[PDB]
Design goal:
InterPro entries (chains A, B, C): NTF2-like_dom_sf, SnoaL-like, WW_dom
Largest interface: A-B, 34 and 39 residues
CATH class of chain A: Alpha Beta
GO molecular function (chains A, B, C): metal ion binding
Number of strands of chain A: 6
Oligomer: homotrimer
Strand content of chain A: 25-35%
Number of domains of chain A: 1
Keywords (chains A, B, C): Calcium, Metal-binding
Shape of chain A: globular
Bound molecules: 4-nitrocatechol, calcium ion, potassium ion
Distance between the termini of chain A: 29 Å
PDB class: lyase
Helix content of chain A: 25-40%
Protein name (chains A, B, C): Pea pathogenicity protein 2
CATH architecture of chain A: Roll
Chain lengths: ~220, ~220, ~220
């Protein structure tokens, strides 16, 4: 079933609309390109001053705190990379609002006592972006993902870790292996993130349309 | 050997040509972004009223029929996703014609009696696009793929299905695992789709250049 | 730690800057799209007349020589494909210089006496691009990669080759499986390419900033 209630500017349009969607698509791609390379000045430039992000391993975080704990994770050997997999934009020109839709694979490299493995999670980043009236610059205020499917990837093609059914069961279908593997590192995993189906799926689309309509949104789903 | 007989607008150029290639590249990315999310209003907006698409599992279909059977497949648990892998455009400004070249991986999740597995097929979508003279809007009239290579992907890193040599043999090299796995679902697989080499490879490039030259094309290869 | 000493034009900006970054991002994507399809006229159009490229299997090569040996490799059955994984640009408008940052997976299909396998190497292509003052056209003068991680991929989901520890040990971490598998084909592998960490990582960022500052660069790291 079509999750969108209406249509927004997403293809063709004026040169101004094309260039707005291009600018927003660049912001989205900044997450994989700059985070994976620890280009923190570039990464911070993507966001509003009051921005919040959500991940499986951090839950919601103000962006500056997210950068702090990301640096700490990287210093402790955490190795998360991204593959961007298709980016388009929904633009609301009169509201100065846009949604960036960026398909991706989160590909995180782990060790098991040594057995190397990736967990690859196909997902869709949703960037809630706004245009500064004065400068015309787009910035992201919120980033939250849909989680679609995941898998365990052997690095040598022979050996892979083992997860019990009970170890995987507490996580939503879509990020069970990613959640379980990150939990083994000691992280407290957010279990209230949207997947391909269900309650939080409709909720995410509701908040996306609220944003594009100009409202405040409610992406804080534990209170 | 270089399959192109000549060169078209593909890099640099005027701002108008850059923005035309950008608009066409967005159309291409609409297939992965909108089909994977069942955003059917957005997906239908990519196409002309008389558009036709080709897939391994459907053969040629008018786009509205393709949407109907895609919805039916999804209701029956079919789980096809796409990873877009690099998109560029060949533009013929005087003909109001363009070809979108979108590298992708078709990644389809299957079950085997239960063993979960993906088949990942590296391919290249070819979007035959035309510009409305009145509105200036680009739309896709035809979509057909080159199929380059495929593989079976274990989801848990340990278990994978088994395909006999005879089960794989009827399919062209490039989509043998994808065809064989989709056939197990009951689909009648199109065996006349182009791959990295051979008769239909040259034919596809011939039709691409015919389109860019302004002709009608013949992508219907069974009559 | 943030490897960049300063910031360049990378998001938002004027329409002219947006369109310059778009044009450079297209050049980058030409490598996967045109090389994988043997579209050699298109591929050669990406480069300056005096361009040089670096790969694991060729070392540094003037681009026309690289095309010659790539054609020879393909005739001998070499099967390298690319998946583009996120592309952004650093622009220095006053210098007429840009750096294209293109995340990618090199995915090379091999045989072992027969066992089919891929090696997939996550990497970042760095395109050193310059703008022709007369025409305004962007072209790439240098292409060199960061190599981040790699893995062996079973094609049938059951069988995979075996590499000894000693066979992998001479290569930098980031492309050990890719180097080892290409060496089995008879290629002499360049061992002085940058990875996620260390001496050549800082050197690459130094040369990137030198380029953006307008200098000649020194990417020739064996003399
Ligand atoms: O940027 N990352 O590191 C991310 C972003 C979202 C996630 O859910 C995640 O597990 C990692
Ligand atoms: O969009 N899909 O579902 C597609 C498109 C082309 C294919 O050949 C296919 O097997 C699936
Ligand atoms: O284009 N290719 O064939 C490439 C480019 C860089 C590499 O390091 C490589 O092994 C292959
Ligand atoms: Ca604008
Ligand atoms: Ca709330
Ligand atoms: Ca136009
Ligand atoms: Ca015909
Ligand atoms: Ca320009
Ligand atoms: Ca030197
Ligand atoms: K991509």
């Amino acid at each position: 079933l079509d999750p969108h209630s209406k249509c927004y500017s997403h293809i063709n349009g004026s040169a101004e609309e094309l260039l707005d969607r291009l600018a927003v698509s660049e912001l989205c791609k900044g997450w994989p390109v700059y985070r994976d390379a620890s280009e923190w000045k570039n990464y911070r430039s993507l966001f509003t001053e009051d921005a919040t992000v959500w991940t499986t391993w951090s839950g919601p975080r103000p962006v500056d705190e997210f950068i702090t704990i990301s640096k700490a994770g990287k210093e402790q050997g955490v190795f998360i990379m991204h593959r961007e997999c298709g980016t388009l934009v929904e633009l609301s020109p009169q509201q100065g609002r846009a949604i960036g839709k960026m398909k991706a694979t989160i590909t995180q490299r782990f060790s098991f006592p040594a057995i190397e493995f990736d967990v690859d999670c196909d997902c869709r980043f949703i960037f809630f972006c706004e245009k500064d009236t004065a400068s015309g610059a787009w910035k992201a205020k919120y980033v939250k993902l849909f989680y679609e499917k995941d898998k365990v990837v052997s690095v040598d093609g022979h050996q892979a870790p083992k997860f019990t059914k009970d170890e995987l069961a507490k996580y939503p279908q879509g990020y069970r292996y990613l959640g379980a593997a990150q939990a083994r590192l000691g992280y407290d995993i957010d279990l209230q993130l949207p997947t391909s189906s269900g309650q939080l799926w409709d909720r995410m689309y509701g908040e996306m349309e609220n944003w594009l309509g100009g409202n405040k949104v409610d992406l804080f789903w534990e209170h």
